[PDB]
Each structure stands twice: as structure tokens, then as C-alpha cells.
Amino acid sequence: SNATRDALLKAMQVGETSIEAAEYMATRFEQILTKAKLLPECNDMLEKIKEYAQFVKFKLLSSAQVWSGQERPTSDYQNTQENKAEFLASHLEGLPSGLKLEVAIGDDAKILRGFSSNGKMVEGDQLKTMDGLLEGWLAKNSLAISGGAVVKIDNTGNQTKVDPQEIRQLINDSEKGVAKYFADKGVGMEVAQRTYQEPKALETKREEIRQEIES
Secondary structure, eight states, X not given: OOHHHHHHHHHHHHHTTOHHHHHHHHHHHHHHHHHTTXXXXXXXXXXXXXXXXXXXXXXXXXXHSOOOOOSXXXXXXXXXXXXXXXXXXXXXXXXXXXXXEEEEEOTTOBEEEXXXXXXXXXXHHHHHHHHHHHHHHHHHTTEEEETTEEEEEOTTOOEEEOOHHHHHHHHTOTTTSHHHHHHHTTOOOEEEEOOOOOHHHHHHHHXXXXXXHHO
């Protein structure tokens, strides 16, 4: 049980606590490795730590921002969401700059979303406005988030499965996309689609790093 191993493991654990700690995790790993003269032999561990930090940042942002949209509730789901969004689009003051939406659609239709401002988590009523606008865009395209997945909703409220690549290209569309919907609602923003990462993939990445630390 060498002290460097405990330090690296604590650095990984601390980096998983918050987005700021994840942004600084790779720097801390480099400090520990250089202080132990473990570079350039441990360069691969540092590269994996940087990539893991990016994965952890998106995981923390998506998880912390809890989705409160109507899963099963439908009926007149389209018009009600559109009206709530026409309201959210007047009460737009007090929204930060550099707004970014990170969205991942898996091959199994699983969806993850994160709203960020200049690299910082959007919280509170600001987050409520952004999520309401996203729910409005979803309703306009007859879409809902149920069970952590994107589903198509019929007028009566029937839930059907959706095609992932179709939704991926719909998000980035110039006319029917999220960015256009937000802009027409008075919100300047950037949409950055990222690859969906299932839990087991993140667990494998973490296990790789941990095994290299314990080696």
C-alpha cells in the first residue's frame, strides 16, 4: 500500500464529486505522478483520466439536473407545453450567457441531457425555463421522455418506440432542431450532441484506471 496509490485513488474519488473537481482531476493526477516521477511511464493512465473526467462531467451534469417532464401524462400535451413555453419565453430575463445543451441519444433510445452555462451547471428557475423549452420542442415534434428514453406519443397518448438516428438528426436540423426552437423562443444557445454512454461503459473505464493505479 504505497502512498502514491492512495493519493491517485483519492484524486479519482474527489474528481467524481463535482464538475469542478472533475475538471481538475487530470491536473491533480499529473501533480501526483510527477511528484513520484511516474511519467512518462504512466502517460496512458493520465490520458484515460482526462477522458474519464469528460465522461464524469457529463454524468454529473445530467444526473444532478433531474428531469421533471410528463412521462405518461398526455391528453392535450402539445398545446399546453407550447403555451407554457410562450410564457417561459417572456420571462426570459435572468438567463446566463454561453448557454449549451449537451444531449446524447443511445441506440436503445435512451436519452441524457445537460444544460450548462460557460461550463457551469444551470440550476433553479433558469434550469426550469430551459427544461420547459426542451419539453415544448419535444411536444411540438410529438416526443416525450419516458423511462429515460425518447418515445413517440400519439394524440390519445399511445407510447411508441422511436428511431435513435432519426431523433439525432432531428435535434441538429436547421428548421426543426432544438437550437432553432430555442432561438425562435428568444434564447440563444448551442446544441452539442455527444455519444451515449451506458453505465457499464463508464464502469469499464473506471475499472481500467483503478486497476492501473493498483498495479
